[PDB]
Amino acid sequence: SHRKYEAPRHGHLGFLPRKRAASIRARVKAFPKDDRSKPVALTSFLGYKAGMTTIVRDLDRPGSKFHKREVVEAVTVVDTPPVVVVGVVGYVETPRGLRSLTTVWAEHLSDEVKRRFYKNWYKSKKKAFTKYSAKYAQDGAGIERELARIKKYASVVRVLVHTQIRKTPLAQKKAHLAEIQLNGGSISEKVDWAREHFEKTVAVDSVFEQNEMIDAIAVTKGHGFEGVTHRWGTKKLPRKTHRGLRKVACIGAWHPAHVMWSVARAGQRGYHSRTSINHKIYRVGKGDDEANGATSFDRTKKTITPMGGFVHYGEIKNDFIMVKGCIPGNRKRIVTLRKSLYTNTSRKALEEVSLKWIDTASKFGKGRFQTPAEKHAFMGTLKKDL
């Protein structure tokens, strides 16, 4: 018989299966659409999620009740050291899809990127790309034939880049390596840009700028095996229920005589790769700069790092992206920040944002002070200070 009262379906069927991701670095399944008129630029960037804080800014929405009034918003910080370009690859297009045909690497590869090609680095002869560098140090013979091959073929050019993990407070020492699409100029201009930028660093302000709406691609925080009540949000069974109550009561009818795929069941929660779109950049900070946390209104020389550092992460000595709201993934996780796939006007994506004040109090408790100078000025002298 029919269901007595209608109710919406628990959970989203388009995020199935809720399994663990294949890697800890989420894959960029789509890049922004190319046009061969703009200069040669990357479509995305890599960073490490550091943590969240608050800002105060003056809202500019002509018609809202909070027009020209101060609001406090939550932002999250992504530590972005300059990425190192080692390698390019070209993709021809077949009736079975895109297919890579060659890969041309840089000459000198650092230890932190060539640690990616090892599971046991400490017991190794470190022989990686040695015969490839021996293919180099001729005039050009085995090199520009592959480069002219990518020019002659290969309708899509992607650049192999790797992070500088040693510039971050993470204890990993093994960099992350990825492919980023180039979206400017012709194929020859793309591969000429890559050849000029082998063994060179690309900063985050070369690809991003303020008031830009971007996407965050990351693997979410893992939670292990989870029951159906928190994994899917189903209603808790009543108190006098024998054999437990964090369950789904009916898992299917008599016919069809099988459990359906659409029935909510227990399993892994979290550690899924997600792509969250439309996050506005509030600040592209420079690590070679004091007063990162200062605005034009605050004007007190303080860095973006809070008191006592970011909890479980550390310091923000490199460049960073301040982006509005929440992004998937927890702290210390690799995250890929991507340009928007479409042009959004919306009278919200076009809003110019100027910050007033950035919170730098401690996140390891109810912090009262933004700077140690302010803490010392408020509390006076102590016994430990003579």
Q: Pick from RNA, other proteins, Mg ion, none: which does 35 bind, CB < 5 to 8 A by kind?
A: none
* Residue 232 token pair: 């899917």
Report 223-262 residues binding other proteins (CB under 8 A).
235
Number of CB atoms found within 10 A of residue 118's CB:
13
Q: How many residues bind Mg ion (CB under 5 A)?
A: 3
Strands (E) in the chain, as ranges, are 44-59, 69-79, 83-94, 97-104, 156-162, 177-181, 200-202, 213-219, 225-226, 267-268, 273-285, 320-324, 334-339, 355-358
- Distance set, CA 228 to CA 91, 221, 264, 272 (Å): 43, 18, 6, 17
Nearer residue to other proteins within complex by CB, 27 or 356: 356
What's the min distance (Å) between Cβ of 208 and RNA? 19
Does position 370 interact with other proteins (CB under 8 A)? The reply is yes
Are 327 and 49 contacting, i.e. CB atoms less than 8 angstroms apart? yes
Report 92-121 residues binding RNA (CB under 7 A).
96-100, 116-119
Nearer residue to Mg ion within complex by CB, 151 or 363: 363
Pick the stretch among 11-19, 164-172, 286-294, 372-380 that binds RNA (CB under 7 A). 11-19
Are 326 and 337 contacting, i.e. CB atoms less than 8 angstroms apart? no
Does position 2 interact with Mg ion (CB under 5 A)? The reply is yes
Q: Pick from Mg ion, other proteins, RNA, none: which does 370 bind, CB < 5 to 8 A by kind?
A: other proteins
3-class DSSP state of 122: coil
Does position 343 interact with RNA (CB under 7 A)? The reply is no
For helices 187-196 and 144-152, what crossing angle results, to 10°?
A: 150
Pick the stretch among 134-142, 265-273, 295-303, 371-379 that binds RNA (CB under 7 A). 265-273
Nearer residue to other proteins within complex by CB, 338 or 363: 363
DSSP string over 129-179 = SHHHHHHSSSSSTTTHHHHHHHHHS-SEEEEEEE--GGGSS-S-----EEE
Determine which residue in the list 149, 267, 295, 340 makes contact with RNA, applying CB under 7 A: 267
* Residue 208 token pair: 């991003």
Nearer residue to RNA within complex by CB, 288 or 352: 352
Instruction: Classify each residue of 352-371 as buried b or exposed e, where b means 16 or more C-beta atoms within 10 Å of its C-beta.
Output: ebebebbbbbbbeeeeebbe
Task: Give me the residue label for tokens 């369950």.
Answer: 247
Report 226-245 residues binding RNA (CB under 7 A).
226-227, 229-230, 232-245
Give the Cα separation of 341 and 43 in Å (integer). 10
Nearer residue to RNA within complex by CB, 108 or 386: 108
What's the min distance (Å) between Cβ of 150 and other proteins? 52
Pick the stretch among 15-23, 134-142, 198-206, 283-291 that binds RNA (CB under 7 A). 15-23
Are 182 and 42 contacting, i.e. CB atoms less than 8 angstroms apart? yes
Nearer residue to Mg ion within complex by CB, 2 or 12: 2
Report 40-99 residues binding other proteins (CB under 8 A).
54, 56, 59, 65-72
Does position 377 interact with other proteins (CB under 8 A)? The reply is no
Q: Nearest CA to 358 among 282, 288, 278?
A: 282
Report 124-153 residues binding Mg ion (CB under 5 A).
none
Are 193 and 206 contacting, i.e. CB atoms less than 8 angstroms apart? no
Q: Read off the DSSP letter of residue 201.
A: E
What's the min distance (Å) between Cβ of 386 and Mg ion? 32
What's the min distance (Å) between Cβ of 73 and other proteins? 8
The residues of the shown chain that bind other proteins, judged by CB under 8 A, are 5-7, 54, 56, 59, 65-72, 235, 356-357, 359, 361, 366, 368-370, 378, 380-381
The residues of the shown chain that bind Mg ion, judged by CB under 5 A, are 1-2, 363
